[PDB]
Design a protein around this ligand. Structure first.
Ligand SMILES: Nc1ncnc2c1ncn2[C@@H]1O[C@H](COP(=O)(O)OP(=O)(O)O)[C@@H](O)[C@H]1O
Ligand SMILES: Nc1ncnc2c1ncn2[C@@H]1O[C@H](COP(=O)(O)OP(=O)(O)O)[C@@H](O)[C@H]1O
Ligand SMILES: Cc1ccc(-c2nc(-c3ccccc3C(=O)O)cs2)cc1
Ligand SMILES: Cc1ccc(-c2nc(-c3ccccc3C(=O)O)cs2)cc1
Ligand SMILES: [K+]
Ligand SMILES: [K+]
Ligand SMILES: [Mg+2]
Ligand SMILES: [Mg+2]
Lengths: 322, 322
């Protein structure tokens, strides 16, 4: 479509987490919605550009074509909406944003299926990794903007949209610990206990949304490895130790397990999409998605394998405030 | 000299640690000495080539020139010796090797002084790091060959020259722990206790010589950081935890301290020669020498800083046997 061509070239306008805390007023609701209305089609068109740039044989896969078609229909639905002038115009847009978040819920699952089906034709090894990294980060960016504006309507305590003003890293870790242990216990009959140390009382403004994905994935990985390495003593398994290091530059969460580590042969494949050695696991998405997430947010995800003993996983996320 | 020109081009012949275990027979003494006699001048000439390749203004420094002159006189002394035919010819060579090890004892200290004096003229940032990395590794290579042949005369238990047949990583760590604590206690009035865990009963053939330098340097660093971060409670300081991970590919020694970590601003300078934030410390050689050492021996030295909490230092060394 010619309308998509125009918005693909248009540069992306990023709203810094520090700037995002401008929710005062309800004139602040209109100001935010007017931004969301202009910024959402640009992000969609940038991704349509990525589908258009895929090699022909891959872009032709019926599942890839379907996802491409979903992105085009999404851009159509969003741009057709008239500009926001009053609180009635702001209200109807929120319903399009909520529909966008539901119509595109399974885009990554269809994209992985389509890309996997096209294995025979994929020559560039990096092609799939870069396409999924770019898709996953754009979606996080869109979901961040969309959830933030939708959350501005609610009067959620300790939050300004999706920014928590008083986030405790200990609390968010604790939240996922019991959730991962319940999944682990289901498959292995037991789960390792988790110990949290370091800056346990650190409290700071932060966006928990990315941590809500990364932490359960990293805890599921650490727990599965601990269980698969202690199969002969499933009830006597070593604890997973999480350390919080909060400094003025970044937040570091180190997840140290005694699960035998990542084998030297698998060490270069663990960060590849679909690579697994196994619903908890048997997907191969946990690590590459978590790294793409951490890096998109000015951080990093680093692995330190001690083969025969365990692994230390270092999640770093840059603090809010420049 | 024209004789040096000839041996600079001659490729280096490396004796694999696995091959080195050929001490049988005393015809094995002659076979080894005949190799040492031919290989030692090649290693010296390769380094003379490095001095000849330094930029003129740097090579002209009187201290640099003196070290260059030491390498030339060393090559002269070694090549002038007649080939080894009998046990009297083998015996006299061992005295030249022992003299070589003493005449060149302070080469690195003079080289660092000369290179530091030439700071104003050094344009390439990597120049000093690569020169010292190459000097330190060549010396380790020469010292390995020289000490191995000299040790073949002794009947040291559990050793074949410099290869320990039954090395315990726990024991060698323990050996340096009390030594580093005594140095640390002298400056800070106390020292952190050290805890060793993991493959504590692992025993394997290995060359301890590089570990005899790396371990005390890494323990001195971890202990100094722990003391400087707990200055208000110098008698209540956290333990330094060393983990041994012995697998079929490599030996991993992780030294984890709660010494506040390496600051983000210093993180890229810590591996540079002379960089320090301070006879234990105030040298800036510990980290870059240890990494050059680990890498020369098919391993690595990796740092993981948790700013505000501590640092994890990962020493990896490839096992003996291909
Ligand atoms: N803590 C860990 N210890 C050992 N291996 C791990 C650990 N975390 C991840 N891995 C390895 O990395 C592979 C890929 O991980 P991930 O991307 O999370 O996928 P999945 O959990 O679906 O298998 C896993 O199958 C596993 O072999
Ligand atoms: N465990 C550690 N924790 C914190 N900082 C460290 C640690 N190890 C090294 N460093 C930093 O790296 C610098 C350089 O280390 P090194 O090369 O060992 O030199 P030196 O010990 O002579 O200062 C140190 O001055 C220190 O600031
Ligand atoms: C336009 C749009 C619609 C839905 C989304 C969603 N993203 C998620 C998600 C959450 C965690 C890890 C990955 C993902 C992922 O599918 O991208 C769920 S719905 C993002 C953008
Ligand atoms: C020909 C020759 C002579 C002496 C040597 C020595 N090397 C050391 C040493 C030990 C540990 C860390 C560094 C060094 C270092 O000075 O290279 C001491 S004497 C190496 C080669
Ligand atoms: K993976
Ligand atoms: K240093
Ligand atoms: Mg996973
Ligand atoms: Mg040191």
């Amino acid at each position: 479509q010619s309308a998509i061509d125009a918005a693909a070239e248009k540069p992306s306008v990023r709203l810094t987490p520090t700037m995002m805390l401008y929710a005062g007023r309800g004139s602040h609701l209109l100001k935010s919605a007017r931004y969301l209305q202009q910024e959402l089609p640009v992000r969609i068109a940038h991704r349509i550009k990525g589908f258009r740039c895929l090699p022909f044989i891959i872009g032709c896969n019926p599942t890839i074509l379907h996802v491409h078609e979903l992105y085009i229909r999404a851009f159509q639905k969003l741009t057709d909406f008239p500009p926001i002038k009053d609180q009635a115009d702001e209200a109807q847009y929120c319903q399009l944003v909520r529909q966008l978040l539901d119509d595109h819920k399974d885009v990554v699952t269809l994209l992985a299926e389509g890309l996997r089906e096209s294995r025979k034709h994929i020559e560039d090894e990096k092609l799939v990794r870069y396409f999924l990294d770019k898709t996953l980060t754009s979606r996080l960016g869109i979901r961040m903007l969309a959830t933030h504006h939708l959350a501005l309507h609610e009067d959620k305590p300790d939050f300004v949209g999706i920014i928590c003003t008083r986030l405790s890293p200990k609390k968010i870790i604790e939240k996922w610990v019991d959730f991962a242990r319940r999944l682990c216990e289901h498959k292995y009959g037991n789960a390792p206990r988790v110990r949290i140390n370091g800056h346990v009382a650190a409290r700071f403004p932060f966006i928990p949304m990315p941590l809500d994905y990364i932490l359960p994935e990293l805890l599921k990985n650490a727990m599965r490895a601990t269980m698969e390495s202690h199969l002969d003593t499933p009830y006597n398994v070593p604890d997973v130790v999480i350390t919080i290091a909060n400094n003025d530059v970044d937040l570091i969460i180190r997840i140290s397990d005694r699960g035998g580590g990542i084998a030297h042969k698998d060490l270069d494949r663990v960060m590849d999409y679909h690579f697994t050695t196994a619903p908890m696991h048997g997907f191969g998405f946990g690590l590459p998605t978590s790294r793409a997430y951490a890096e998109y947010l000015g951080g990093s995800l680093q692995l330190q394998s001690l083969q025969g003993i365990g692994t230390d996983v270092y999640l770093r996320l840059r603090h809010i405030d420049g």
